[PDB]
Amino acid sequence: KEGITRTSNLSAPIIQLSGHAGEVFSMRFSPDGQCIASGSFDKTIFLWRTYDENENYNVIAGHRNAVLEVHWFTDGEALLSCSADKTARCWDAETGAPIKKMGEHTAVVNSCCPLRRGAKVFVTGADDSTVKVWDMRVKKSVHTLRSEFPVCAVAFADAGDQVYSGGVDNAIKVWDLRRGGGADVEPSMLLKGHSDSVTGLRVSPDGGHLLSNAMDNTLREWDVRPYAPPNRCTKVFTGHMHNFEKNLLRCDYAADGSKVACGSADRMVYIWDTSTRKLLYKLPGHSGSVNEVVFHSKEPIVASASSDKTIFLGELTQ
């Protein structure tokens, strides 16, 4: 009955992931697309399989406060967790052991992004208005830039030399780390056009486009190509929501650059078609503000995480 074109191998087209005991603040799909890293407010990371049971086969603990942001490392076996307990942590996924815990920040480490081409290096931007760059094998932080306003969202560019940081200061900045080996570098690019804070930053699958979610209830698409018009602003999306919760609401690109998914505070999973700049999917089902949405590496699968201690995991039909 109803036989509507099963896309994925998942048992069902809509799967809810439960087992957390707090808000789920950020999630991430394995590069090989058969793992889930879910970081909750309960300062814990659930590791789920994407197929055949959706088994949370490991719960990694070790943060003393909410694990606000999780990415995987480029090979998928090491995990980068960032928290409110001022401590970013590198873990081994298969094992259940923590590898390297760096806690150099003074306040909540809101945002992080690990570099996708090059060395094992990740940026982390926290409440101290400082965006710091962290190389894996040294135990000191390799870079430290100081804005004046608490850093909400940070990303490392496709190519690996600049860092994007956006926060409460109404303008997102692009900085050059090789241009800066000093302790008070000044910003390279000032993307303006959001009318208040930025909450989430995603680097496009080609690297020319940066996605910014703003509590300006606006998704904005900028181009980072060093040869741009005077206004790097390309696209605007309307539809999602930000409320008094001021949660860390993020961005994502479909693995093809064809869709863009935002987490919203109206409990809705929003998925726009980037081209027509209009709303493809408006999926309900979450009882709390939708914190981050992640598109599965291979298939059109979208998985969302909410402040309702669950994660919906399903495929898109049209």
Partner 1 sequence: SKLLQYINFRMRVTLVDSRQIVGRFMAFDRHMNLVLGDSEEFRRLPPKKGKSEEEREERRVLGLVLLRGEEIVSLTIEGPPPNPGGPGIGRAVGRGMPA
Partner 2 sequence: LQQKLLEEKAKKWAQLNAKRYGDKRKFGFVEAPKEDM
Partner RNA sequence: GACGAGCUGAACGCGAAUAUCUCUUUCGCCUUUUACUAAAGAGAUCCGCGAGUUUUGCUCACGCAGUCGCAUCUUUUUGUGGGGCU
Partner RNA sequence: CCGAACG
Applying CB under 7 A, among 52, 53, 64, 97 the residue interacting with RNA is 64
Residue 10 CB, nearest approach to partner 1 (Å): 9
Considering just the CA atoms, what is the radius of gyration of the chain in Å?
18
- Binding flag, residue 107, partner 2 (CB under 8 A): yes
Contact 206, 216 (CB under 8 A): no
Question: What CA dihedral angle connects 30, 31, 32 and 34, to 10 degrees?
Answer: 20
User: Cα separations (Å) of 138 from 71, 120, 142, 218?
Assistant: 20, 11, 8, 39
Q: Which is nearer to partner 2, 127 or 315 (CB)?
A: 127
Position 17 contacts partner 1 (CB under 8 A)? yes
Q: How far out from the chain centre does Cα 283 lie?
A: 19
Nearer to partner 2, 217 or 274 (CB): 217
Pick between residue 62 and residue 125 the one whose CB is nearest to RNA. Answer: 62
Which residues ranging from 39 to 98 are in contact with partner 1 (CB under 8 A)?
A: 46-48, 53-59, 96
Residue 214 in the binding site for partner 2 (CB under 8 A): no
Looking at 16, 144, 188, 258, which residue binds partner 1 (CB under 8 A)? 16
110 binds partner 2 (CB under 8 A): yes
Q: Single out the residue of 117, 33, 32, 96 nearest to residue 313, CA to CA.
A: 33
Q: Does 159 bind partner 2 (CB under 8 A)?
A: no
> Would you count residue 66 as binding partner 2 (CB under 8 A)?
yes
By CB under 8 A, name the one of 9, 11, 231, 243 that touches partner 1: 11
CA–CA distance from 42 to each of 29, 63, 151, 199, 233 (Å)?
A: 20, 9, 22, 21, 37
Number of helices and strands in the chain (H, E): 0, 28
Contact 241, 265 (CB under 8 A): yes
Minimum distance from residue 60 beta carbon to partner 1 (Å): 9
Q: Using CB under 8 A, which of 26, 28, 43, 241 touches partner 2?
A: 43
What minimum distance in Å lies between the beta carbon of 140 and partner 1? 29
Looking at residue 115, the DSSP 8-state letter turns out to be -
Q: By CB under 8 A, tell whether 109 contacts partner 2.
A: no
Using CB under 7 A, which of 12, 14, 21, 61 touches RNA? 61
Q: Which is nearer to RNA, 22 or 257 (CB)?
A: 22
Residues 6+ apart with CB under 8 A from 214: 194, 195, 196, 197, 198, 199, 220, 242
Contacting residues toward partner 1, per CB under 8 A: 11-12, 14-20, 46-48, 53-59, 96, 283-285, 312-313
